[PDB]
């Protein structure tokens, strides 16, 4: 069991793939920064956080690539101790900065979709800049153990030198703490906050869709009433009209519920005349449902149509694509970080799994490095596709 090894293909596939990731990601992130700063100026909170995310990805692609040559030939590190520190702190820095910026992006989307008026505009841009400052400071301070403790280490008598984490205690709790904060504060709490924000967004999106869908049933049957004269089809049109009005009243406080109370009152009045064999009066009475639509329900319908239009924004699709891809690229790393942190504690004592975890950690860092390269490709949706004009120009 102690004798093993899978570096026959890792030492050749990763360096070329790492170089491809480096070039593609650096070009894409430079383009994203250039467009977000000039083609669509920083006039929104989302653009400020997305520019910061692109800058963090650029910093990761600029300070890690020494890992590409670190793994290109064995695990030798013929660089400076400072270079080892700044290349080993970059994984933690990028993880924390990107995850905090993504949580703030989700919070901003939640506020912009479900609290359109509770959040101001002048006081948010300054708040966004201050939050970005605090996020970068927090990411830098959470990468301080990898600066203090990471050091260059000559292996035995031979000249091979590695960038090793120096724990000045055999029974040291720093490896457990660093590997657990990377799992809890780096993954768990941000993931829970993002899930709550997106579920609350979906809850408001469902309520907005319910009001408009139920009003559509009210609208279609209203036209059916006017374009019909048999004293019977009017009844079925109002039957579907009454149920839609009752369902729409359940969306939502007193003014909204009151506004739908007269609406169902007019529907019943139309059914009273329809049941009496009168069509003109039934058709005439159904016309007042438009007058009460403007008085009470129109102001609530527009707030629902606007909310549904926010889902169709490019910035919403890009942010949720970035959030989803970040948690898919980093979940191999957090799973094996948790697997490794269990081995140190002695929770799992099995030689076979330990070799698997050791050979998987370099790949998990590789996958997380791939996330920075594929992030600017999500921006190629619409509106931001004007970068093609900039490239040709």
């Amino acid at each position: 069991c102690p004798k093993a090894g899978r570096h026959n293909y890792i030492f050749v596939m990763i360096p070329t793939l790492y170089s491809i990731i480096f070039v593609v990601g650096i070009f894409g992130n430079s383009l994203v920064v250039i467009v977000i700063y000039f083609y669509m100026k920083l006039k929104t909170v989302a653009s400020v956080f997305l520019l910061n995310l692109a800058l963090a990805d650029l910093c990761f692609l600029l300070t890690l690539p020494l890992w590409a040559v670190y793994t290109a030939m064995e695990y030798r590190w013929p660089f400076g101790n400072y270079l080892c520190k700044i290349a080993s702190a970059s994984v933690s820095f990028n993880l924390y900065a990107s995850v905090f910026l993504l949580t703030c992006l989700s919070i901003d989307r939640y506020l912009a979709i479900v609290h359109p008026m509770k959040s101001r505009l002048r006081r948010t841009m300054l708040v966004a800049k201050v939050t970005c400052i605090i996020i970068w400071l927090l990411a830098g301070l959470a990468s301080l153990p990898a600066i203090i403790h990471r050091n260059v280490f000559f292996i035995e008598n031979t000249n091979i030198t590695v960038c090793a984490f120096h724990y000045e205690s055999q029974n040291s709790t720093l490896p457990i703490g660093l590997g657990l904060t990377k799992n809890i504060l780096g993954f768990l709490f941000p993931f829970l906050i993002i899930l709550t924000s997106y579920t609350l967004i979906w809850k408001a999106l469902k309520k907005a869709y319910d009001l408009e869908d139920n009003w559509e049933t009210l609208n279609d049957n209203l036209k059916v009433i006017e374009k019909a004269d048999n004293a019977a089809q009017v009844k079925d049109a109002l039957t579907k009209m009454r149920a839609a009005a009752l369902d729409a009243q359940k969306a939502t406080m007193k003014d909204f519920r009151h506004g739908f109370d007269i609406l169902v009152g007019q529907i019943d009045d139309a059914l009273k005349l329809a049941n009496e064999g009168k069509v003109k009066e039934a058709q005439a009475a159904a016309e007042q449902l438009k007058t009460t639509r403007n008085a009470y329900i129109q102001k609530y319908l527009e707030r629902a149509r606007s909310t549904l239009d926010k889902l169709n924004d490019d910035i919403f699709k890009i942010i949720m694509a970035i959030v989803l891809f970040f948690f898919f690229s980093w979940i191999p790393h957090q799973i094996f970080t948790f697997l490794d942190v269990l081995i140190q504690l002695g929770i799992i004592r099995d030689c076979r799994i330990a070799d698997i975890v050791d050979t998987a950690m370099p790949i998990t860092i590789c996958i997380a490095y791939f996330n920075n390269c594929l992030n600017p490709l999500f921006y190629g949706f619409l509106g931001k596709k004007f970068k093609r004009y900039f490239l040709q120009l």
Partner: antibody, heavy 122, light 106 residues
Framework: EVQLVESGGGLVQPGGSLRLSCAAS????????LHWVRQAPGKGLEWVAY????????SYADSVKGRFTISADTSKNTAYLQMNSLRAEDTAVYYC?????????????????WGQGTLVTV | DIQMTQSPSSLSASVGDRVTITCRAS??????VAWYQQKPGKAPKLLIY???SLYSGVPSRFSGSRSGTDFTLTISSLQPEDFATYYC??????????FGQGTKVE
């Protein structure tokens, strides 16, 4: 307390006429819509008619229209159901229920209070 | 003419068991669905109104739920007094009242 009492049932020959009644107590008929729900022996409940002491919107079931005439007398706080041209399918127990008007929760409560029912056989 | 269909025409159950009765509507009737309980020789008693709201004076064992057009009545703790016929109702309008067929529980 709130209570609905039915009376006027009995046994008559097919094609005869009957005058069912639904007395009320503990509530007014002006603010409640009084219905008539019929349950055939061994069968389920089927709606028959309804009247309002309000403006006066009345209705009847499709299988009973033309031979039934529901009426309300707010002075006596009771509702009547005129029956004529009774067919063999009209043998059942007739329950009178109450149902509030649309504004508010009284409408959502459906037939909150029923009556003991009266038996009609033809 | 909205037709209400009740899935179990009968439902044998033991005391303390949990039973479920399901209703389906021809059209959408919103939550305008009430549940009744008729014992033999007696008038029905309203249990749940608005398809999810327990009526006053009714034990909390009874419950109702709505998922679009399907309405379900659920009792989690059956008692010896629960053996009766449970009817359905759609009350979207005064002249649009249609009941179910019955779910005699034994």
């Amino acid at each position: 307390e709130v209570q609905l009492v039915e009376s006027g049932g009995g046994l008559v020959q097919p094609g005869g006429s009957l005058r069912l009644s639904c007395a009320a107590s503990g509530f007014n008929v002006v603010d409640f819509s009084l219905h008539w729900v019929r349950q055939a022996p061994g069968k389920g409940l089927e709606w028959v008619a309804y009247i309002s002491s309000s403006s006066g919107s009345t209705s009847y079931a499709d299988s009973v229209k033309g031979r039934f005439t529901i009426s309300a007398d707010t002075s006596k706080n009771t509702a009547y159901l005129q029956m004529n041209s009774l067919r063999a399918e009209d043998t059942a127990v007739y329950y009178c229920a109450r149902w509030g008007y649309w504004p508010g929760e009284p409408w959502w409560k459906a037939f909150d209070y029923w009556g003991q029912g009266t038996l009609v056989t033809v | 003419d909205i037709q209400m269909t009740q899935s179990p025409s009968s439902l044998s159950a033991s005391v303390g068991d949990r039973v479920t009765i399901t209703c389906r509507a021809s059209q959408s009737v919103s939550s305008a669905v009430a549940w009744y309980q008729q014992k033999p020789g007696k008038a029905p008693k309203l249990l749940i109104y608005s398809a999810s709201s327990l009526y006053s004076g009714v034990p909390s064992r009874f419950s109702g739920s709505r998922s679009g057009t399907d309405f379900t009545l659920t009792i989690s703790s059956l008692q010896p007094e629960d053996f009766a016929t449970y009817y359905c109702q759609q009350y979207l309008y005064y002249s649009l009242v249609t009941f179910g067929q019955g779910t005699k529980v034994e």
